[PDB]
Amino acid sequence: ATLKDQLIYNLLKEEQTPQNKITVVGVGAVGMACAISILMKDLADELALVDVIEDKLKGEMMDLQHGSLFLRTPKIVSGKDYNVTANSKLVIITAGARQQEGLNLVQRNVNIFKFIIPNVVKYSPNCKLLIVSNPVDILTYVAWKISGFPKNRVIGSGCNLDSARFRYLMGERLGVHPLSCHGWVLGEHGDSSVPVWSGMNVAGVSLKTLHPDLGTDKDKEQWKEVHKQVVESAYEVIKLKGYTSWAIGLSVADLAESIMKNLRRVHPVSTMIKGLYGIKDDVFLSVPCILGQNGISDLVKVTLTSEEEARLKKSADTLWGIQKELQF
Amino acid sequence: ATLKDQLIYNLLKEEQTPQNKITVVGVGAVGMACAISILMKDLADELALVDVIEDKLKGEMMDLQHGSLFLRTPKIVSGKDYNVTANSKLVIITAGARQQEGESRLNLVQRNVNIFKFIIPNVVKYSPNCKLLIVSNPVDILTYVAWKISGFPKNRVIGSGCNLDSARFRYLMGERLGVHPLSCHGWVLGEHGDSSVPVWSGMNVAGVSLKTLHPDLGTDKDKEQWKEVHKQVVESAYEVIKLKGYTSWAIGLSVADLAESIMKNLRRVHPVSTMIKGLYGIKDDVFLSVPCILGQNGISDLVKVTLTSEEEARLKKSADTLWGIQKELQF
Amino acid sequence: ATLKDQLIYNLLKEEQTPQNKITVVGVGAVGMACAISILMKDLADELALVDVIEDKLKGEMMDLQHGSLFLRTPKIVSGKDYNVTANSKLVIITAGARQQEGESRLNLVQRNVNIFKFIIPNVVKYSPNCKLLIVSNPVDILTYVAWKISGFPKNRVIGSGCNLDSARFRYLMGERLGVHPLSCHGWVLGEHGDSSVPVWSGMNVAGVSLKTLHPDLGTDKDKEQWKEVHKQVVESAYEVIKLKGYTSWAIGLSVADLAESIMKNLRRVHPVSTMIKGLYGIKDDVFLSVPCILGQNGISDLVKVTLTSEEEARLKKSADTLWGIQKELQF
Amino acid sequence: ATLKDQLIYNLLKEEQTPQNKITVVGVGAVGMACAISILMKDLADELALVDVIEDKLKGEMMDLQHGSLFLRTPKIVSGKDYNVTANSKLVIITAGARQQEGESRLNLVQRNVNIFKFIIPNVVKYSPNCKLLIVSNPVDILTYVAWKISGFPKNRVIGSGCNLDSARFRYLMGERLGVHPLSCHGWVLGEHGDSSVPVWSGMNVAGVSLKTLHPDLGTDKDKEQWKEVHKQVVESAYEVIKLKGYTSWAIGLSVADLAESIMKNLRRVHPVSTMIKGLYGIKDDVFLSVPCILGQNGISDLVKVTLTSEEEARLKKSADTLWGIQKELQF
Ligand SMILES: NC(=O)c1ccc[n+]([C@@H]2O[C@H](COP(=O)([O-])OP(=O)(O)OC[C@H]3O[C@@H](n4cnc5c(N)ncnc54)[C@H](O)[C@@H]3O)[C@@H](O)[C@H]2O)c1
Numbered sequence A: 001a002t003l004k005d006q007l008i009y010n011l012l013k014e015e016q017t018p019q020n021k022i023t024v025v026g027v028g029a030v031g032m033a034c035a036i037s038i039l040m041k042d043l044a045d046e047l048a049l050v051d052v053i054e055d056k057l058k059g060e061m062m063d064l065q066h067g068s069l070f071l072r073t074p075k076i077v078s079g080k081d082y083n084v085t086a087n088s089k090l091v092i093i094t095a096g097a098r099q100q101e102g103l104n105l106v107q108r109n110v111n112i113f114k115f116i117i118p119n120v121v122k123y124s125p126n127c128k129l130l131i132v133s134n135p136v137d138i139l140t141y142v143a144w145k146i147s148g149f150p151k152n153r154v155i156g157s158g159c160n161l162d163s164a165r166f167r168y169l170m171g172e173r174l175g176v177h178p179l180s181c182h183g184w185v186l187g188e189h190g191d192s193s194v195p196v197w198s199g200m201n202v203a204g205v206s207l208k209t210l211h212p213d214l215g216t217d218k219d220k221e222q223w224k225e226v227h228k229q230v231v232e233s234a235y236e237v238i239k240l241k242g243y244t245s246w247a248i249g250l251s252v253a254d255l256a257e258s259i260m261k262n263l264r265r266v267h268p269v270s271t272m273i274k275g276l277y278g279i280k281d282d283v284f285l286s287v288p289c290i291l292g293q294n295g296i297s298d299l300v301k302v303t304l305t306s307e308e309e310a311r312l313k314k315s316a317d318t319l320w321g322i323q324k325e326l327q328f
Numbered sequence B, C, D: 001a002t003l004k005d006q007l008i009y010n011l012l013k014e015e016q017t018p019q020n021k022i023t024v025v026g027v028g029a030v031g032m033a034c035a036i037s038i039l040m041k042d043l044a045d046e047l048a049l050v051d052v053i054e055d056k057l058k059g060e061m062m063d064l065q066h067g068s069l070f071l072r073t074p075k076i077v078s079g080k081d082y083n084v085t086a087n088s089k090l091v092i093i094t095a096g097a098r099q100q101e102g103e104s105r106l107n108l109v110q111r112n113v114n115i116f117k118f119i120i121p122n123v124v125k126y127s128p129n130c131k132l133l134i135v136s137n138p139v140d141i142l143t144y145v146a147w148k149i150s151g152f153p154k155n156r157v158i159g160s161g162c163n164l165d166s167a168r169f170r171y172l173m174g175e176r177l178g179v180h181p182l183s184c185h186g187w188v189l190g191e192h193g194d195s196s197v198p199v200w201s202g203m204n205v206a207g208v209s210l211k212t213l214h215p216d217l218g219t220d221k222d223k224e225q226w227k228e229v230h231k232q233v234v235e236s237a238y239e240v241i242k243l244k245g246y247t248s249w250a251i252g253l254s255v256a257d258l259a260e261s262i263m264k265n266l267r268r269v270h271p272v273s274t275m276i277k278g279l280y281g282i283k284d285d286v287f288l289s290v291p292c293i294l295g296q297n298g299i300s301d302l303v304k305v306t307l308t309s310e311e312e313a314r315l316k317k318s319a320d321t322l323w324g325i326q327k328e329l330q331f
C-alpha cells in the first residue's frame, strides 16, 4: 500500500548497537571542529552530540546531517539527555565554562564535569575519555576521580597541540614537512610546557648533536624562540579571531584514529605520572604514550635533563596544590 | 654555517608555480567550512585565503597552519592583496553582505554586486585561466554578475546552485526510505532556494522510478504526501538559521565535492547554476541549476532533463524574475 | 631488565578481543586483491588470512606485514588453523578449484562443495556471529551451499553476485556517454555471469531514463547497438582470462565496496546474490542478485524491481537452471 | 542524432591534457602493485601502463578499467608505444629481466642496461620534465644508468633504494617494542639489499635514542641481540621469494608513499638512492640511499647524516663495489 512497502521488502528490523560510536560533549568551536574532523576521517559509524544549549545543538546536528551525502557516517544524533551517548567507544569532552568571571574558571569546570562524567559512565562504562577542556591536566584528574575508570581509559589532550605547533615552526625554519620534523613538547599543557631539545631530530640526526647551543641563551640562531613562538601564536589566534578550532580539532581526530583503529602510535598526551620523574602525587602530565583500543596501554620513559626534570616537578607541585584543595 | 646548512644540503632552490592551487574569497562561516573540507580531502597543494577583515583572516590562516602536521597541504597563504591568489586552478567566492530588517532584495543584490565589482577583476588579474565557483547569495544572479565582469566563457563560471538543495533532499528521501542518501537519487533544479523545482520523474532508488510505482508522487492529492520532502528542505534551511544563525558544514562539504570533480577531472554530474539561455523556452542571459558534467574545463557538458509542463513553467517564471532584477543592475 | 622494559613502562598487558576483524579464506589472485583493497580503505583493525597452501600463505602475510608502515591495520595474521579467524565480523570466501578441460558443470561445482564442507563449519566454529561474503564460482550456487551448511539466517549469507557485472556495465555505459561510472546508473541482476539480466528501465544518468529517450534500448533492432554494452561485459570477462589468465583488481575493489557498507553500516544498495524465494515467480531455495540494502546485519532489506515479462522469464529460467544443480548436490 | 546527443548537450569540445599523469613501465608483480597503490591513494588523474608483453598489458589495463567505479582516476591507458606516456609528472620503471640459471650477476646487469637503453630515451622523448623513479634491480646501478642516458639533473633521477629496507626494519623494530612502525624511527642507508647500513644512532621512539639507553645496540656484545633485527630484514626478503616467488605489496605501497610526496610536493624525508659523489669520501659517480627531502622538483635537498667510522667505511666500500661493475658497463 505505502511506497516504502511497495519499493522495499524488509527481511529483519532487528535493533543493533553501534560498533564504532563517538560522543562529543560540548558543541562549541572546539567540539564542532573535532566532530567534522572525525566524520571526514571516517572514524565513526555513529556520532553523538551533547550540550546544555538546546537550540545551537539541534542546529549543528542538522547542518552535519544535511552533508551526510558527502560523509561515510550513517547516524548523527544529538540531545540534552545522555541516552543518545549509549554504547559509545570514545567520549570527547570539550565542555567548558565561559571565560567571564561571575567560583573561578578551574572551579566552574570541575562542577560542569560533576554531572557530565557520571552521566557518560552511566550509558558508556567501557569507553575511553578524551579530555580537551582547560586546565586539561587538572580536569583529566577530575574525570579520572569521578569516573573511577582505570588510569589508561582516562586520556587528556595535553601537549598534543603544543607539539603540533612546535613541529610546524621547526618545519618552516628547516623547510621540511612537520611529519619529518620530530619534536616533543612535554609536561603541563600551555605556558609551562617543556620542549625536549635532545629528542628534536630530522631523519634520526639529533639537532642538539649538530648544534649544542640548541635551546640555550648563547644560541646565535636562537632556537629557544621556536617554543616561545608556540605560546605567542596561541595568544595571537585568540587576539585575532577569538578562539582556536581547526588545529585542536585535527589533533583530537589524530588521537581518535589511534584509539578507534588500535594503531599503537606514540602521542604527547596527559596521563598519570605517579612513579616517574620523582613525582609521588596523583597528577596528570603529557608524556609520550602508546595509544590503542585499551587507551594508554604503555608510556615512553623520556631521559630528561636536570632543568627539564625540575620544570616537570615544579608543574607537578603547582598542580597537586590545586587538586588537593578540590572538593567532590 | 647555520644549523639548516649543517643538517640539510640543498640541490636546487628553484621556486616553481603551484600546480593545484585553490583560492577562497571570504573567510566567513561558509568560507572556512569550504577551506577545511578541501584540506581534509587533499585537493590542493596550496590554499590561498582572501578577506576584507585583516585580523580574522590572519587568525584563520594561523589556525589552519598549526594543524599542517595532520594535513597533506604544504602551503596555506592569506592576505588583503590578491597577489597571494596568483596561478589558481579554482577560485571559490563565498564573500557576501548580511541583509537587514529594513532592506530591499534589489538593494542586497546591488551591495553584493559592488563587492563582486572589486573581487572578480582582482581574481582574473592574477588567475586568468581559473574556474569561478560562486557560493554567495543570490547564487543564480551573482554567477551572472561574475560571468559579465570576468568576461570568462560560460563553462569557466560555475555557480553552487541547487547542489545543497539536492543534498538536503536526498537526505530526507534517505531517512524516509531508510536507505543511504548515496543510494537515494533525487534532483532539485532551477533557481536555488524557495523557487527550486524537484524533478519527481528522476526520483529513484536502484533505478526503479518512484513516480512509476506511485503516480501521485509530488502531486497535491498524494496520500503519503511526498511533496512534504521538498517542503521540509526549505523549512530545514530556515530552521538551521533560527537555531544556530548560519549554515556551514553542509555547504562546505558540497563545495568540496564540486572541487573534487573539477580538480581531478572526474566528469561526474552535479546540480549547478549555469547559462540556461536557449532551453525550456528561455531567451534571457539567466543562470539556473541543471545537471552538469564537471571536469578540468569547468562545465564541459549539460544533461537535457525531460521536464513536465508545470516544471517548465516554474523554470520560465524564475528566469523572468531573475532577469527582472538583472536588467535593474548597476555595473 | 630488557630495552622494552627500560624504554616503555606498561600500564596493562590485557589484550582485547578483535573488534573490526576481517577473514579472507583463499589467498589466490582474488583473495589477495580483496585483502589489499580492504587494508588500503582502512576497514579492519585485524586481518586474518587462511589457505590450504601454507608456503604461499606465509609469504603473502609477510609481504603485507612489511608494508604495515603505509597501512592503518595493526594486526595481520595467517594460518592453516581457523583459530586465527576467531571473532571475525566479516568472512570473505574466495577459495575455489580451477576449471578443467572436458569438465561437467555438476562436476566442478561438487569439487567446490567439498571445499566448502570443510571451510563453512570451521568458520562458524570461531566466528558464529559473522557475515559470510561468497566470491567463489558458481557464486549463486555456492552462496546457497554456504547458507545450508552454516545454518545462518539468509541475511548473514551474502553472495558477490552481479556486483562486478554492474561495475563493468557502468564503466562501458560511462565510456560511451563520456561520464564517470558513478554518474552512470545501471543495474544488472539475476544469475552472475552469462545469464545476467540488464535492467534497461533502470538505466539512467541524472535521473533521466535512457529507455524513455531511446525506446529501442536493449533490443537487437537498435541502430546504436546499446545491447552490445551488456554483450561487451560478458566478452571482456572472457578477454581478461585470455590475455592475463585471471581477474583480480576489479573484483577485489568491488568486494571492499560491499565490505565498506557492512563494516560501517552504510545501508547502501548493492547488486548481491540473496535468497529470492517468493519474488518473481521463484519457488525454489535459489540465490539471485537483486538490489539489497547492506548494513551491520548483512542484508536487512531488498529492493522490489519492476521487471518486464522478458526479464522475469530470464530470472525464472536461471532459477530452474540453478535448482537443477542444487537438488543434485551431495553434502 | 544519438542517445549521447539526446541525453547530453555539449558546451565545448576542448581536448584535455592530464595535469597529474603517472606512467608505470613494467606490468609485472611490482608494476601492478605500484599501479593499484597509486589509484587507491588518488594520486593521478591519468595512469599510463607500458610493457613489452602486449597480451598481459591489455588484460591488466582492462582489469583496472573495470574497477573504475570504485576509483577516482578517470583515465587508464596502455600500449607498446610510449606516445601513451606523453606529459607524465612521474615515471616509475619496474621493468627488468630475471637472473637465468647459467647467468652471472654481471650478465644480468648488462641485460637490464640494454632494457634501459630502450626505455629511458623513449620516456624522455614524450615526458622531458618528468621525475624518474627506478625500482628495478640493481636499483643503485640502474638509477645511475637512467641518469646517464636521460641526461636529466641528479634531482629528477630518484631510485627506490633503501625505502623498503627501512620499511621492513621499522616493522621488526615495531614488533619487538610493541609500537606502530610509524612511531618506530629507524634508518637503513647505503646500497639497497645485503650491503645496507643500519644507522643505530638514529634509531629512536619519541625522540629518545635507543643507542643511548642501550650502548651495545647493533654490536655483537649485545645481550638482547638487536643486530638480528637488520639480519632478519635480509632473511625475510629471501624468505618471501622462497615462500611465494616474488615481492609485490610491500614495495608497491612504498613506491606510492614516495609518489605521494612527489605528486603533492609534501617535502617529507625518505631513504632513496641518489648521487652520493662528494659525500662520505666518495669520488665516483655512484647512487646510494641517504635521507632526501622529496617534492615536486624531485630531490630538492639531502640530509647530512653523522655516520660512525665503520658506517662511513661500509658506505665507501659499497660505492667502490658498485663502481667496479659500473665502469665495465657498455651503453
Ligand atoms: N586542550 C587544548 O589544547 C585546547 C585547545 C583549545 C581549546 N581548548 C579548550 O576547549 C574548551 C572549549 O573551547 P570552545 O571554543 O569549544 O569554547 P565554547 O565556550 O564555545 O564551548 C564550550 C561548550 O561547552 C558547553 N557546555 C557547558 N556546560 C556544559 C555541560 N554541563 N554539558 C555539556 N556541554 C556543556 C557550552 O554550551 C559550550 O557549547 C575550553 O575549555 C578551551 O580551553 C583546549
Ligand SMILES: NC(=O)c1ccc[n+]([C@@H]2O[C@H](COP(=O)([O-])OP(=O)(O)OC[C@H]3O[C@@H](n4cnc5c(N)ncnc54)[C@H](O)[C@@H]3O)[C@@H](O)[C@H]2O)c1
Binding pocket: B025, B026, B027, B028, B029, B030, B031, B050, B051, B052, B053, B094, B095, B096, B097, B098, B115, B118, B119, B134, B135, B136, B137, B139, B160, B161, B164, B192, B246, B247, B251
Ligand atoms: N549557495 C548556497 O547554497 C549557500 C549556502 C549557505 C550560504 N551561502 C552564502 O554564503 C555567503 C556567506 O555566508 P557566510 O556564513 O560565510 O557569511 P559571513 O557574512 O560570515 O561571510 C562573508 C564574508 O565575506 C567577507 N567579505 C565581504 N566583502 C568582501 C570582499 N570585498 N572581499 C573579500 N571578502 C569579503 C566578509 O569579511 C565575511 O568574512 C552568503 O551570501 C550566503 O548566502 C550560500
Ligand SMILES: NC(=O)c1ccc[n+]([C@@H]2O[C@H](COP(=O)([O-])OP(=O)(O)OC[C@H]3O[C@@H](n4cnc5c(N)ncnc54)[C@H](O)[C@@H]3O)[C@@H](O)[C@H]2O)c1
Binding pocket: C025, C026, C027, C028, C029, C030, C031, C050, C051, C052, C053, C094, C095, C096, C097, C098, C115, C116, C118, C119, C134, C135, C136, C137, C139, C160, C161, C164, C192, C246, C247, C251
Ligand atoms: N564472483 C565473481 O564475480 C568472481 C570474479 C572473479 C573470480 N571469482 C572466483 O574467485 C575464485 C578464486 O579465484 P582466484 O583467482 O583467487 O583463483 P585461485 O585458484 O588462484 O585461488 C583459489 C585459492 O583457494 C585456495 N583454497 C583451495 N581450497 C581451499 C580450502 N579448502 N581452504 C582454503 N583455501 C583453499 C587455493 O589454495 C587457492 O589459493 C574462483 O572460484 C573464481 O571463479 C569470482
Ligand SMILES: NC(=O)c1ccc[n+]([C@@H]2O[C@H](COP(=O)([O-])OP(=O)(O)OC[C@H]3O[C@@H](n4cnc5c(N)ncnc54)[C@H](O)[C@@H]3O)[C@@H](O)[C@H]2O)c1
Binding pocket: D025, D026, D027, D028, D029, D030, D031, D050, D051, D052, D053, D094, D095, D096, D097, D098, D115, D116, D118, D119, D135, D136, D137, D139, D160, D161, D164, D192, D246, D247, D251
Ligand atoms: N627496489 C626494490 O626494493 C625492489 C623490490 C622488489 C622488486 N624489485 C625489482 O622489480 C623488478 C621487477 O619485479 P617484478 O616482480 O615486477 O618482475 P617481473 O619479471 O614479473 O616484471 C618485469 C616486467 O618488465 C617487463 N619488461 C621487460 N622488458 C621491458 C621493456 N624493454 N619495456 C617495458 N617493460 C619491459 C616484463 O614484460 C615484465 O612484465 C625486478 O628487477 C626486481 O628486482 C625491486
Ligand SMILES: O=C1N[C@@](c2ccc(N3CCOCC3)cc2)(c2ccsc2)CC(O)=C1Sc1ccccc1Cl
Binding pocket: A099, A134, A161, A162, A165, A189, A190, A191, A230, A231, A234, A235, A237, A238, A242, A243, A244
Ligand atoms: O589550550 C589552549 N587554549 C586557548 C584558548 C583560549 C581561550 C578560549 N576561549 C575564549 C573564547 O571563548 C571560547 C573559549 C579557548 C581556547 C588559549 C590561547 C592562549 S591562552 C589559552 C587556545 C590555545 O591556542 C590553546 S593551546 C596553548 C595555549 C597557551 C599556550 C600554549 C598553547 Cl599550545
Ligand SMILES: O=C1N[C@@](c2ccc(N3CCOCC3)cc2)(c2ccsc2)CC(O)=C1Sc1ccccc1Cl
Binding pocket: B098, B099, B137, B164, B165, B168, B192, B193, B194, B233, B234, B237, B238, B240, B241, B245, B246, B247
Ligand atoms: O542559500 C542559503 N542561505 C541560507 C543563509 C545563509 C547565510 C545567512 N547569513 C545571514 C546571517 O549572517 C550569517 C549568514 C542566512 C541564510 C538561508 C537559509 C534560509 S533562507 C537562506 C542558508 C541556507 O541554508 C541556504 S540553502 C536554502 C535556502 C532557502 C531555501 C532552501 C535552501 Cl536549500
Ligand SMILES: O=C1N[C@@](c2ccc(N3CCOCC3)cc2)(c2ccsc2)CC(O)=C1Sc1ccccc1Cl
Binding pocket: C098, C099, C137, C164, C165, C168, C192, C193, C194, C233, C234, C237, C238, C240, C241, C245, C246, C247
Ligand atoms: O566470475 C567470473 N569468473 C571469471 C574467471 C574465470 C576463470 C578463472 N580462473 C581461476 C584461476 O585459474 C585460472 C582460471 C578466474 C575467473 C570468468 C571469466 C570468463 S567466464 C568466468 C572472471 C570474471 O571476470 C568473472 S565475472 C563474469 C564472468 C562471465 C561473464 C560476466 C562476468 Cl561479469
Ligand SMILES: O=C1N[C@@](c2ccc(N3CCOCC3)cc2)(c2ccsc2)CC(O)=C1Sc1ccccc1Cl
Binding pocket: D098, D099, D137, D164, D165, D168, D192, D193, D194, D233, D234, D237, D238, D240, D241, D245, D246, D247
Ligand atoms: O630488492 C629486492 N629484490 C627481491 C626480489 C625481487 C624480485 C625477484 N624476481 C621477481 C620474479 O621473477 C624472479 C625475480 C626476485 C627477488 C629479492 C629478494 C631476495 S634478494 C632480492 C625482493 C626483495 O624483497 C627485495 S628488497 C631486499 C632484498 C635483499 C635484502 C634486503 C632487502 Cl630489503
